[PDB]
Copies of this chain bind each other. A is one copy, B any other.
């Protein structure tokens, strides 16, 4: 029993965190085999941050300019290649603590753990959700650039995110492990607009199934609705339209509780129109959407 926001054990990822130093700019790096992945703006100083020419800034840099440090040991760079917004640095040692990794790009609505690092040392770990506008409700202080987002499938660490820049609107922009940014963001410290943040419909429906499993069920009603009728209300409260693919994902959650997918939608519809009237679901008065259907299965099986 109990429903908690849970991060994946960060241990495997911890053995990959190094401190990358280029002149005055120092950030975090991901040491996988003999390659150190870090945001390309490590070559840039507090000067270039407004409008930097990355392709021209790399020209005035050599292997001796980069100072990769694996804790106490000072690794030596033997090659530099800038792919998209990430800088790949080849080193002498092919990391002994390398886990069975893979690089994937997470879709909006999906979740991952973030291991926050400061000066190459892991600080903490928390669970994040990629918002539909491609932003993350995170916590990044000065020196967290290079921190990675990941998922764990038994022994395989799937890397999906790397922190690059702090959004002025409080939010946080970053790239996948191949250097491609999420959303309409670039690695320049300029006024960037995040956009409109819609509530993930399928993640709230998955969270409602977890409340039923935990005994909390004061929100259950006799009403029932169809896909087209429920979607009308979704476009009024900033919610995503539920497709047939979303219903197929909510399979094991519907079979475990017993409540049908179309019947649960009516319980959600009444809580948005009327409200919660001071009562709480799973220890919270707000509809939580940072929990994918796979996150609910992982914790209730």
Contacts and interface: CB of A to CB of B under 8 A. Distances in A.
A244 interface: no
Interface in A167-181: 167, 170-172
Interface stretch (A10-18, A45-53, A251-259): A10-18
Interface string A7-38: 11111101100000000000000000000000
A9 B285 contact: no
A2 interface: yes
A86 interface: no
B5 A126 contact: yes
A41 B245 CA distance: 46
B14 A138 contact: no
Contact of A7 (B1, B125, B170, B283): B125
A10 to B, nearest CB: 5
Interface in A112-142: 115-116, 122-126, 137-141
Interface residues of A, number: 42
Chain A contact residues: helix, strand, loop or mixed: loop
A187 interface: no
A8 B123 CA distance: 7
Nearest to A124: B6
Contact of A4 (B115, B126, B171, B301): B126
Interface string A124-167: 11100000000001111100000000000000000000000011
A190 interface: no
A227 B283 CA distance: 29
Nearest to A1: B170
A299 B139 contact: yes
Contacts of A137: 2, 4, 283
Contact of A9 (B123, B283, B286): B123
A167 B1 CA distance: 9
A3 B139 contact: yes
A215 B170 contact: yes
Contacts of A284: 285-286
A9 B1 contact: no
B214 A170 contact: yes
A125 B6 contact: yes
A221 interface: no
Interface of A: 1-12, 14-15, 115-116, 122-126, 137-141, 166-167, 170-172, 214-215, 280, 283-286, 298-301
Given A1-B170, A9-B14, 14 more contacts: A1-B139, A2-B138, A4-B138, A4-B139, A7-B126, A8-B125, A9-B122, A9-B125, A10-B10, A11-B12, A125-B125, A141-B299, A141-B300, A280-B286
